[PDB]
mmCIF file of C-alpha atoms in Angstrom:
data_model
loop_
_atom_site.group_PDB
_atom_site.id
_atom_site.type_symbol
_atom_site.label_atom_id
_atom_site.label_comp_id
_atom_site.label_asym_id
_atom_site.label_seq_id
_atom_site.Cartn_x
_atom_site.Cartn_y
_atom_site.Cartn_z
ATOM 1 C CA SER A 2 126.208 83.893 132.470
ATOM 2 C CA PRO A 3 125.114 87.312 133.866
ATOM 3 C CA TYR A 4 123.022 88.007 130.744
ATOM 4 C CA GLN A 5 120.349 85.600 129.525
ATOM 5 C CA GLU A 6 120.801 84.305 125.917
ATOM 6 C CA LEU A 7 118.096 83.937 123.206
ATOM 7 C CA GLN A 8 116.824 80.313 122.774
ATOM 8 C CA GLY A 9 116.254 78.591 119.374
ATOM 9 C CA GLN A 10 117.147 80.488 116.148
ATOM 10 C CA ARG A 11 115.323 83.254 114.162
ATOM 11 C CA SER A 12 112.983 82.070 111.329
ATOM 12 C CA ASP A 13 112.339 85.703 110.157
ATOM 13 C CA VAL A 14 114.221 85.646 106.766
ATOM 14 C CA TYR A 15 113.378 88.445 104.304
ATOM 15 C CA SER A 16 113.892 88.032 100.545
ATOM 16 C CA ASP A 17 115.752 90.840 98.605
ATOM 17 C CA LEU A 18 116.536 91.675 94.910
ATOM 18 C CA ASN A 19 120.299 90.598 95.071
ATOM 19 C CA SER B 5 100.716 108.674 102.852
ATOM 20 C CA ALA B 6 100.435 104.847 102.256
ATOM 21 C CA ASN B 7 97.056 104.942 104.210
ATOM 22 C CA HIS B 8 95.387 105.788 100.818
ATOM 23 C CA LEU B 9 96.350 102.289 99.438
ATOM 24 C CA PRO B 10 93.443 99.810 99.920
ATOM 25 C CA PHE B 11 96.001 96.897 100.264
ATOM 26 C CA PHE B 12 98.031 98.637 103.080
ATOM 27 C CA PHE B 13 97.306 96.960 106.471
ATOM 28 C CA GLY B 14 99.555 99.239 108.609
ATOM 29 C CA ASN B 15 101.266 97.690 111.681
ATOM 30 C CA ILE B 16 100.243 93.974 111.279
ATOM 31 C CA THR B 17 102.821 91.186 111.886
ATOM 32 C CA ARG B 18 104.438 88.875 109.292
ATOM 33 C CA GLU B 19 102.139 86.115 110.728
ATOM 34 C CA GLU B 20 98.952 88.259 110.368
ATOM 35 C CA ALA B 21 100.058 89.176 106.773
ATOM 36 C CA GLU B 22 100.457 85.417 106.016
ATOM 37 C CA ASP B 23 96.947 84.707 107.564
ATOM 38 C CA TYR B 24 95.482 87.436 105.258
ATOM 39 C CA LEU B 25 97.234 85.982 102.141
ATOM 40 C CA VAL B 26 95.819 82.486 103.060
ATOM 41 C CA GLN B 27 92.316 84.076 103.520
ATOM 42 C CA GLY B 28 92.749 85.783 100.082
ATOM 43 C CA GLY B 29 93.442 82.404 98.369
ATOM 44 C CA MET B 30 97.320 82.325 98.403
ATOM 45 C CA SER B 31 97.266 82.742 94.545
ATOM 46 C CA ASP B 32 100.541 83.530 92.662
ATOM 47 C CA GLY B 33 101.110 87.338 92.666
ATOM 48 C CA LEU B 34 98.604 87.954 95.538
ATOM 49 C CA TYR B 35 100.240 90.714 97.680
ATOM 50 C CA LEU B 36 99.712 93.283 100.444
ATOM 51 C CA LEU B 37 101.724 96.116 102.039
ATOM 52 C CA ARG B 38 102.385 96.610 105.777
ATOM 53 C CA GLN B 39 104.420 99.045 107.907
ATOM 54 C CA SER B 40 107.952 97.713 108.664
ATOM 55 C CA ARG B 41 108.145 96.761 112.367
ATOM 56 C CA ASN B 42 111.986 97.150 112.509
ATOM 57 C CA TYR B 43 112.919 99.864 109.880
ATOM 58 C CA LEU B 44 111.777 103.427 110.746
ATOM 59 C CA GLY B 45 109.653 104.949 107.900
ATOM 60 C CA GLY B 46 109.924 101.522 106.172
ATOM 61 C CA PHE B 47 107.288 99.166 104.672
ATOM 62 C CA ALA B 48 107.180 95.414 103.976
ATOM 63 C CA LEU B 49 105.761 93.766 100.828
ATOM 64 C CA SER B 50 104.248 90.280 101.398
ATOM 65 C CA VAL B 51 103.626 88.199 98.215
ATOM 66 C CA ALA B 52 102.164 84.688 97.604
ATOM 67 C CA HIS B 53 104.080 82.508 95.064
ATOM 68 C CA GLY B 54 104.398 78.671 94.875
ATOM 69 C CA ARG B 55 101.900 78.394 97.821
ATOM 70 C CA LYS B 56 104.558 80.167 100.063
ATOM 71 C CA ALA B 57 104.821 83.718 101.514
ATOM 72 C CA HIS B 58 107.732 86.008 100.459
ATOM 73 C CA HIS B 59 108.494 89.175 102.515
ATOM 74 C CA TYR B 60 110.607 92.171 101.318
ATOM 75 C CA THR B 61 111.622 95.178 103.452
ATOM 76 C CA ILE B 62 111.112 98.519 101.609
ATOM 77 C CA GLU B 63 113.537 100.962 103.348
ATOM 78 C CA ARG B 64 113.145 104.771 103.290
ATOM 79 C CA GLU B 65 116.553 105.951 101.880
ATOM 80 C CA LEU B 66 118.340 109.091 103.304
ATOM 81 C CA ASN B 67 116.886 111.192 100.372
ATOM 82 C CA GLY B 68 113.245 110.054 101.098
ATOM 83 C CA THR B 69 113.029 107.526 98.202
ATOM 84 C CA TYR B 70 112.061 103.831 98.822
ATOM 85 C CA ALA B 71 114.018 100.664 97.853
ATOM 86 C CA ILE B 72 114.317 96.940 98.553
ATOM 87 C CA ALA B 73 118.065 96.120 99.107
ATOM 88 C CA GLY B 74 119.641 95.592 95.613
ATOM 89 C CA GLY B 75 116.778 97.416 93.786
ATOM 90 C CA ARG B 76 116.194 100.842 92.165
ATOM 91 C CA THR B 77 114.794 103.744 94.297
ATOM 92 C CA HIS B 78 111.103 104.807 93.852
ATOM 93 C CA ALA B 79 109.307 108.011 94.996
ATOM 94 C CA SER B 80 106.782 106.030 97.130
ATOM 95 C CA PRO B 81 105.785 102.479 98.203
ATOM 96 C CA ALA B 82 102.784 102.810 95.782
ATOM 97 C CA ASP B 83 105.235 103.487 92.848
ATOM 98 C CA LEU B 84 107.395 100.464 93.888
ATOM 99 C CA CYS B 85 104.251 98.201 93.914
ATOM 100 C CA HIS B 86 103.035 99.674 90.530
ATOM 101 C CA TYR B 87 106.544 99.108 89.008
ATOM 102 C CA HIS B 88 106.717 95.445 90.296
ATOM 103 C CA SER B 89 103.219 94.812 88.786
ATOM 104 C CA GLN B 90 104.976 95.429 85.332
ATOM 105 C CA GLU B 91 108.604 94.153 85.862
ATOM 106 C CA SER B 92 109.656 91.357 88.297
ATOM 107 C CA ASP B 93 113.199 92.964 88.320
ATOM 108 C CA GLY B 94 114.481 90.296 90.802
ATOM 109 C CA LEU B 95 111.222 89.818 92.826
ATOM 110 C CA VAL B 96 109.932 86.186 93.194
ATOM 111 C CA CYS B 97 107.075 87.079 90.722
ATOM 112 C CA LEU B 98 105.003 89.979 89.271
ATOM 113 C CA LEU B 99 102.552 91.680 91.677
ATOM 114 C CA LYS B 100 99.262 90.501 89.996
ATOM 115 C CA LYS B 101 96.414 90.928 92.560
ATOM 116 C CA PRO B 102 96.357 93.218 95.630
ATOM 117 C CA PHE B 103 94.657 91.661 98.692
ATOM 118 C CA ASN B 104 92.638 94.657 99.985
ATOM 119 C CA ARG B 105 91.636 95.306 103.630
ATOM 120 C CA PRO B 106 88.304 93.452 104.127
ATOM 121 C CA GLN B 107 85.287 95.804 104.765
ATOM 122 C CA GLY B 108 85.564 97.678 108.127
ATOM 123 C CA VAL B 109 89.294 96.747 108.605
ATOM 124 C CA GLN B 110 91.536 99.861 109.065
ATOM 125 C CA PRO B 111 95.358 100.060 108.942
ATOM 126 C CA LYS B 112 96.576 98.851 112.391
ATOM 127 C CA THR B 113 98.519 101.416 114.469
ATOM 128 C CA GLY B 114 100.746 100.414 117.442
ATOM 129 C CA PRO B 115 101.388 102.348 120.727
ATOM 130 C CA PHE B 116 104.128 104.688 119.260
ATOM 131 C CA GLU B 117 101.955 105.516 116.190
ATOM 132 C CA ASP B 118 99.128 106.656 118.593
ATOM 133 C CA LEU B 119 101.492 109.115 120.452
ATOM 134 C CA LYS B 120 103.488 110.275 117.332
ATOM 135 C CA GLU B 121 101.179 113.116 116.063
ATOM 136 C CA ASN B 122 100.594 114.622 119.543
ATOM 137 C CA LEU B 123 104.380 114.379 120.409
ATOM 138 C CA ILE B 124 105.393 116.150 117.103
ATOM 139 C CA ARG B 125 102.692 118.848 117.727
ATOM 140 C CA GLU B 126 103.798 119.495 121.381
ATOM 141 C CA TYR B 127 107.530 119.559 120.389
ATOM 142 C CA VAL B 128 106.971 122.208 117.608
ATOM 143 C CA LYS B 129 104.668 124.290 119.964
ATOM 144 C CA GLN B 130 107.256 124.340 122.832
ATOM 145 C CA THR B 131 110.386 124.726 120.555
ATOM 146 C CA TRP B 132 109.014 127.366 118.055
ATOM 147 C CA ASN B 133 106.060 129.025 120.007
ATOM 148 C CA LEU B 134 103.498 128.355 117.198
ATOM 149 C CA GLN B 135 99.676 127.948 117.299
ATOM 150 C CA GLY B 136 96.816 127.071 114.921
ATOM 151 C CA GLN B 137 97.508 126.942 111.160
ATOM 152 C CA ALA B 138 101.126 128.249 111.598
ATOM 153 C CA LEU B 139 101.745 125.180 113.871
ATOM 154 C CA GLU B 140 100.196 122.789 111.248
ATOM 155 C CA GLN B 141 102.183 124.458 108.383
ATOM 156 C CA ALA B 142 105.443 124.058 110.418
ATOM 157 C CA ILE B 143 104.643 120.327 111.154
ATOM 158 C CA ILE B 144 103.924 119.673 107.385
ATOM 159 C CA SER B 145 106.936 121.832 106.265
ATOM 160 C CA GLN B 146 109.467 119.598 108.236
ATOM 161 C CA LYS B 147 107.326 116.393 108.717
ATOM 162 C CA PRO B 148 110.083 113.879 107.729
ATOM 163 C CA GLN B 149 112.758 115.452 110.063
ATOM 164 C CA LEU B 150 110.213 115.822 112.959
ATOM 165 C CA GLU B 151 109.047 112.153 112.504
ATOM 166 C CA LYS B 152 112.729 111.025 112.748
ATOM 167 C CA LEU B 153 113.513 113.247 115.812
ATOM 168 C CA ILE B 154 110.363 112.170 117.785
ATOM 169 C CA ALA B 155 110.838 108.425 116.874
ATOM 170 C CA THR B 156 114.482 108.347 118.203
ATOM 171 C CA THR B 157 113.489 110.074 121.538
ATOM 172 C CA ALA B 158 109.860 108.881 122.178
ATOM 173 C CA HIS B 159 111.084 105.963 124.397
ATOM 174 C CA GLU B 160 112.282 108.480 127.082
ATOM 175 C CA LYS B 161 108.649 109.160 128.270
ATOM 176 C CA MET B 162 107.198 105.637 127.610
ATOM 177 C CA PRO B 163 106.259 103.831 130.855
ATOM 178 C CA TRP B 164 108.700 100.846 130.446
ATOM 179 C CA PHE B 165 111.845 103.073 130.112
ATOM 180 C CA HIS B 166 113.556 103.725 133.528
ATOM 181 C CA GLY B 167 116.650 105.645 132.210
ATOM 182 C CA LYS B 168 120.141 105.108 133.775
ATOM 183 C CA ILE B 169 119.477 102.747 136.766
ATOM 184 C CA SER B 170 121.732 99.864 137.973
ATOM 185 C CA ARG B 171 121.179 96.100 137.422
ATOM 186 C CA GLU B 172 120.528 95.848 141.227
ATOM 187 C CA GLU B 173 118.018 98.788 141.169
ATOM 188 C CA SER B 174 116.130 97.199 138.197
ATOM 189 C CA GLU B 175 115.757 93.836 140.081
ATOM 190 C CA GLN B 176 114.384 95.646 143.189
ATOM 191 C CA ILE B 177 111.814 97.735 141.186
ATOM 192 C CA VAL B 178 110.676 94.676 139.072
ATOM 193 C CA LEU B 179 110.307 92.388 142.181
ATOM 194 C CA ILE B 180 108.090 94.929 144.065
ATOM 195 C CA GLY B 181 104.352 94.104 143.957
ATOM 196 C CA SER B 182 102.406 91.456 141.993
ATOM 197 C CA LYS B 183 104.925 89.145 140.244
ATOM 198 C CA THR B 184 102.979 89.247 136.896
ATOM 199 C CA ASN B 185 104.889 87.093 134.356
ATOM 200 C CA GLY B 186 106.242 89.322 131.524
ATOM 201 C CA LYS B 187 106.479 92.450 133.737
ATOM 202 C CA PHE B 188 109.453 94.289 132.180
ATOM 203 C CA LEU B 189 111.500 97.479 131.925
ATOM 204 C CA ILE B 190 114.390 98.744 129.752
ATOM 205 C CA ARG B 191 117.375 100.631 131.308
ATOM 206 C CA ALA B 192 120.403 102.535 129.845
ATOM 207 C CA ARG B 193 123.943 101.142 130.565
ATOM 208 C CA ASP B 194 127.406 102.889 130.275
ATOM 209 C CA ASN B 195 127.917 103.085 126.426
ATOM 210 C CA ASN B 196 125.465 105.734 125.060
ATOM 211 C CA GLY B 197 123.663 103.259 122.782
ATOM 212 C CA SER B 198 123.724 100.164 125.125
ATOM 213 C CA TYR B 199 120.605 99.066 127.100
ATOM 214 C CA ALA B 200 119.225 96.076 129.052
ATOM 215 C CA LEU B 201 115.761 94.451 128.966
ATOM 216 C CA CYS B 202 114.664 93.282 132.465
ATOM 217 C CA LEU B 203 111.885 90.645 132.328
ATOM 218 C CA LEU B 204 110.082 88.809 135.193
ATOM 219 C CA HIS B 205 109.883 85.016 134.520
ATOM 220 C CA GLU B 206 108.461 82.704 137.310
ATOM 221 C CA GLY B 207 109.600 85.126 140.108
ATOM 222 C CA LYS B 208 113.162 85.472 138.593
ATOM 223 C CA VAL B 209 114.442 88.678 136.853
ATOM 224 C CA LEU B 210 116.059 87.993 133.422
ATOM 225 C CA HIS B 211 118.550 90.558 132.013
ATOM 226 C CA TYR B 212 119.008 90.647 128.205
ATOM 227 C CA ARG B 213 121.682 92.972 126.733
ATOM 228 C CA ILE B 214 120.575 95.421 123.973
ATOM 229 C CA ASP B 215 123.566 96.613 121.834
ATOM 230 C CA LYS B 216 123.846 99.363 119.169
ATOM 231 C CA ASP B 217 125.804 97.941 116.144
ATOM 232 C CA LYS B 218 127.755 100.127 113.620
ATOM 233 C CA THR B 219 124.500 100.911 111.596
ATOM 234 C CA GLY B 220 122.839 102.375 114.760
ATOM 235 C CA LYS B 221 120.645 99.192 114.938
ATOM 236 C CA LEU B 222 119.529 97.865 118.382
ATOM 237 C CA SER B 223 119.419 94.088 119.064
ATOM 238 C CA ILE B 224 119.725 91.436 121.737
ATOM 239 C CA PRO B 225 122.673 89.260 120.550
ATOM 240 C CA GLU B 226 121.464 86.807 117.774
ATOM 241 C CA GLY B 227 118.104 88.710 117.781
ATOM 242 C CA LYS B 228 116.093 90.785 115.248
ATOM 243 C CA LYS B 229 117.614 94.295 114.650
ATOM 244 C CA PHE B 230 115.475 97.453 115.183
ATOM 245 C CA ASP B 231 115.940 101.209 114.580
ATOM 246 C CA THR B 232 114.230 102.027 117.969
ATOM 247 C CA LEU B 233 113.557 100.582 121.471
ATOM 248 C CA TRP B 234 109.774 101.071 121.002
ATOM 249 C CA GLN B 235 109.941 98.764 117.881
ATOM 250 C CA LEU B 236 111.854 96.191 120.009
ATOM 251 C CA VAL B 237 109.200 96.293 122.827
ATOM 252 C CA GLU B 238 106.273 95.988 120.295
ATOM 253 C CA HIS B 239 108.002 92.932 118.680
ATOM 254 C CA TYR B 240 108.789 91.073 121.957
ATOM 255 C CA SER B 241 105.265 91.970 123.285
ATOM 256 C CA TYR B 242 103.772 90.057 120.247
ATOM 257 C CA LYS B 243 105.972 86.894 120.484
ATOM 258 C CA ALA B 244 108.924 85.644 122.605
ATOM 259 C CA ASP B 245 111.217 85.116 119.557
ATOM 260 C CA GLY B 246 114.098 83.816 121.783
ATOM 261 C CA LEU B 247 113.035 85.416 125.126
ATOM 262 C CA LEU B 248 111.786 82.894 127.758
ATOM 263 C CA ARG B 249 108.392 84.659 127.435
ATOM 264 C CA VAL B 250 106.586 87.643 125.853
ATOM 265 C CA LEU B 251 106.681 91.135 127.458
ATOM 266 C CA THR B 252 103.344 92.048 129.184
ATOM 267 C CA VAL B 253 102.938 94.924 131.744
ATOM 268 C CA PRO B 254 105.432 97.815 131.917
ATOM 269 C CA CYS B 255 107.086 98.063 135.372
ATOM 270 C CA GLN B 256 105.684 101.382 136.833
ATOM 271 C CA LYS B 257 108.284 104.138 137.627
ATOM 272 C CA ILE B 258 108.612 105.495 141.281
#
């Protein structure tokens, strides 16, 4: 594991039009 | 030219936009506009409906029109907001009431936005040998192309960017001096589009990979995607969002 990984998950969800 | 809109808050975060909608009553169709923090020239529309916040990215298309993914193009963010006040056209609801900047509150600008106008000016002056009104006419005449050029290159002279240095070199430079938590730099790797974020956490140096995907978008794996490194630094300076901690002080160059 030479590179650190992001912890948790992203809760930045954008809506769109379809 | 979205500064003219009284409901444009500039470079505020999703969370600040949600605080403002709560302060404004969180009524159905209450909405504001902000600068996109991850799409260059972009905006975000934040709307209250069903007591929840809904956020839409308004991208600047190649031809200088504006569109939410799956939507028609408009000439400006103002036109898109005016249109969606008349037709929902796939939006969660009609834009009913703008939430305006409270008295005294200006559009927020971030660090890049404060350098942008001077960097464009100095580039045109050095490249084209212009002064005074000729210089201003040149800047206005090619503003969109100049904005794009300066945004994609501005990181090169920002204090946290250390260019092509090794992993080992980055550890040495970060570990010199006061071991301030969040002390950070970004360095270029082999592939001309790949970078690393180096971040001091409890005396240890963390290395996060930053990759260019097929779009040209920069991200840490599983992370938010950005058009530029300066957008990435502003984001991860506001909240950790997967990092062990937020970025604080740029690691000084030598």
